[PDB]
Ligand binder design. Structure first.
Ligand SMILES: [Zn+2]
Length: 353
């Protein structure tokens, strides 16, 4: 399976060029947090306990960073929006009162202050040239260009240390893979809520918030083996992380080839990551992920993704009644098209690589 390992080798030696870039990101991020912490409403702002400032959503694009700011909201009350099991109105004199539209927490008012505070603060930046970058349109993040080289998306999330919403009751089916002990410990961690956008497959603007468990995703990815010592020695170097990379890259490359067509606009690394986690769940033994079976394992990842497309069924991994592939969200023609692109790619030993 030399081609896949070739591709990987390329992706990795590229992940080193500007990690002086990450150094810049960290400095900007810290100035911003200190500025945001001056405002009474945002005093509890901070990074997620993930052991990192940033992540790379796009593995094609090392210079694009993703950052999350968390804001704890104690004693939070959620109202589930219309049977969509992932979107919620937030309800509860505290400083957050200024973001109330009536009874509910308004995302657009909070983001409004957030952008303005940030936008003024990079005008006085004086570390390196940092400019903002507007949206055409609609996104919840904030995007900065550092040194006309490095981009950072900043997402603001609400943190709740309450127990997880009922819609997750039957989620995170990792019992036969990681232990049920691990599941229990995982669900004791906080959960997060982010502004939906670009786009919601709705709207355009109700003030609902979407659940996020990207901190839980990260933790399983770094502790992903049946064996407590998976990937910690030369004898147990599995290919689970490599398959996710290849899948993310496969989607990205196809999204590039059809850049100015629109058929793949609604597909992202979240679908790939979600399918991947299902495959992990279905193939729980480390021996099913032996480094020497890189080709087979990837093929499984691909054929599992294809079945999801064909059957329009991709369950959110934490929220099982949320279908990322329902016709309500992605049109069938779009899935049919991605199916064909992907079948083509499998049949030809992956030319996009
Ligand atoms: Zn491993």
């Amino acid at each position: 399976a030399s081609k896949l390992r070739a591709v990987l080798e390329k992706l990795k030696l590229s992940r080193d060029d500007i990690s002086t870039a990450a150094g810049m990101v960290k400095g900007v991020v810290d100035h911003l947090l200190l500025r945001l912490k001056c405002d009474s409403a945002f005093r509890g702002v901070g990074l997620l306990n993930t052991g990192s400032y940033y992540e790379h959503v796009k593995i094609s694009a090392p210079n694009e960073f993703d950052v999350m700011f968390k804001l704890e909201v104690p004693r939070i009350q959620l109202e589930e929006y219309s049977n969509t099991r992932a979107y919620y109105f937030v309800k509860f004199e505290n400083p957050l009162s200024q973001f109330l539209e009536g009874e509910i927490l308004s995302a657009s008012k909070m983001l409004s202050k957030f952008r303005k505070i940030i936008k003024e603060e990079i005008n006085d930046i004086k570390d390196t040239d940092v400019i903002m970058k507007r949206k055409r349109g609609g996104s919840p993040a904030v995007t900065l260009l550092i040194s006309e080289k490095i981009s950072v998306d900043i997402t603001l999330a609400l943190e709740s240390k309450s127990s997880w919403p009922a819609s997750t009751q039957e989620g995170l089916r990792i019992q036969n893979w990681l232990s049920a002990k691990v599941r229990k410990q995982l669900r004791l961690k906080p959960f997060y809520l982010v502004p939906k956008h670009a786009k919601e497959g709705n709207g355009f603007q109700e003030e609902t918030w979407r659940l996020s468990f990207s901190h839980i995703e990260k933790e399983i990815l770094n502790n992903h083996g049946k064996s407590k010592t998976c990937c910690e020695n030369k004898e147990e170097k599995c290919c689970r992380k490599d398959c996710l990379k290849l899948m993310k890259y496969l989607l990205e490359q196809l999204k590039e080839r059809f850049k100015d067509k629109k058929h793949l606009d609604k597909f992202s690394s979240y679908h790939v990551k979600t399918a991947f986690f299902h495959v992990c769940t279905q193939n729980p033994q480390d021996s099913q992920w032996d480094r020497k079976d890189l080709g087979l394992c990837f093929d499984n990842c691909v054929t599992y993704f294809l079945q999801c497309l064909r059957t329009e069924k991709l369950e959110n991994y934490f929220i099982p009644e949320f279908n990322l592939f329902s016709s309500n969200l992605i049109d069938k023609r779009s899935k049919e098209f991605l199916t064909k692109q992907i079948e083509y790619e499998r049949n030809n030993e992956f030319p996009v690589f």
